[PDB]
Design a protein around this ligand. Structure first.
Ligand SMILES: O=C(CCCCCCCNc1nc2cc(C(=O)O)ccc2c2cnccc12)NO
Ligand SMILES: [Cl-]
Ligand SMILES: [Cl-]
Length: 330
């Protein structure tokens, strides 16, 4: 026997109902724009497999951002392009304005809308309770939208949320790890950064779905309301699950593993041992108490569940009382 199958609880068949050109990114033909329209102004970042510049569109003198794509797996170029084009115009999704060939190496470069960003290591220190709720709701809007469009982001983390706090404007960026959800498909578990990897990634359960993004979101929320960054501070991939188990407890972990017939490494199983669940109240202290409320902890608790089928969907999350007043704000 093998692992038990799983299906997305919501939006399960969205891609099946669309024409195949929507999700068959390998068959996408790229419409290339005019590289001469853009001139690089300065370097903004040099992440993995990509370089990011501030640039100028000289046909309208619009400040834009150019990301030069250099993945090892070339199939991710069309993938990112197709996903950006399918989600274009959606709430809080970064806008792909153009695609051009870098005149140096003929490598693809994406042109994006420019956002007036403020770094999170400078921002999450000054956020009020209300601000945390408001921006979580904006992220949820983006996630419900991309999930409803058949797409899982798979790399939700602070650096991939651009915030113009002066205008209370938020954009979800870097769709280079995003994939289309197809029921029954097995996905790669190497996605996401360690601190934000869901337990399904950490136990090598490959038939995961949109709910992966809901675990990541939970990890961000916990780090903001408790002012512990990252909240689960694993030092390698096994330690990440150990740190999770020390908070959520091993009883629900072992029930999760049994439910889906997941094959755990025996020495790892021995290492996890037995840990009781810690009540969320243990993480409150005088320095973070102004960010904690009963509805915050209930919401957090309903995002950070081992069983991916048990986590709140983005829409259920948007209906949680934690956002009640925020919902009346717009
Ligand atoms: O949490 C945070 C963390 C701040 C991290 C700073 C990263 C600097 C890179 N800077 C931009 N990287 C982009 C990447 C993409 C993409 O890969 O899709 C799309 C758009 C941008 C972008 C747009 N406008 C201004 C700057 C950038 N801040 O709130
Ligand atoms: Cl406790
Ligand atoms: Cl969802």
């Amino acid at each position: 026997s093998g692992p038990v199958p799983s299906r997305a609880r919501v939006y399960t068949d969205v891609n099946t109902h669309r024409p195949r050109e929507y999700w068959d990114y390998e068959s996408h033909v790229v419409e290339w724009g005019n590289q001469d329209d853009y001139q690089l102004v300065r370097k903004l970042g040099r992440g993995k497999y990509s370089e990011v510049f501030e640039a100028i569109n000289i046909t309208n003198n619009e400040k834009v951002v150019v990301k030069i794509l250099k993945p090892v797996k070339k199939k991710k170029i069309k993938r990112e392009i197709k996903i950006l084009e399918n989600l274009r115009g959606g709430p809080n999704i970064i806008t792909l304005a153009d695609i051009v060939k870098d005149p140096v190496s003929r490598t693809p470069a994406l042109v994006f809308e420019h956002v007036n960003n403020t770094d999170f290591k400078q921002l999450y220190q000054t956020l009020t309770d209300y601000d945390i709720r408001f921006y979580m709701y904006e992220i949820l809007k983006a996630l419900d939208y991309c999930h409803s469009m058949g797409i899982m982001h798979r790399d939700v983390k602070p650096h991939n949320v651009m915030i113009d706090h002066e205008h209370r404007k938020l954009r979800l960026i870097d769709w280079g790890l995003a994939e289309f959800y197809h029921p029954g498909q097995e996905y790669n578990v190497r996605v996401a950064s360690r601190y934000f990897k869901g337990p399904e990634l950490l136990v090598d359960y490959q038939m995961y779905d949109y709910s992966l993004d809901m675990w990541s979101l939970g990890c961000m929320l916990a780090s903001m309301i408790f002012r512990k960054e990252p909240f689960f501070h694993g030092h390698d991939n096994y330690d990440q699950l150990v740190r999770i188990a020390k908070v959520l407890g091993t009883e629900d972990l072992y029930d999760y593993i049994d439910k889906y017939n997941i094959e755990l490494d025996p020495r790892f199983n021995d290492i996890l041992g037995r840990h009781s669940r810690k009540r969320w109240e243990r993480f409150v202290h005088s320095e973070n108490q102004h960010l904690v409320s009963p509805e915050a902890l209930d919401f957090l608790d309903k995002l950070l569940r081992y069983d991916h089928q048990s986590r709140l969907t983005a829409r259920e999350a948007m209906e949680h009382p934690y956002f009640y007043t925020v919902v009346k704000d717009q």
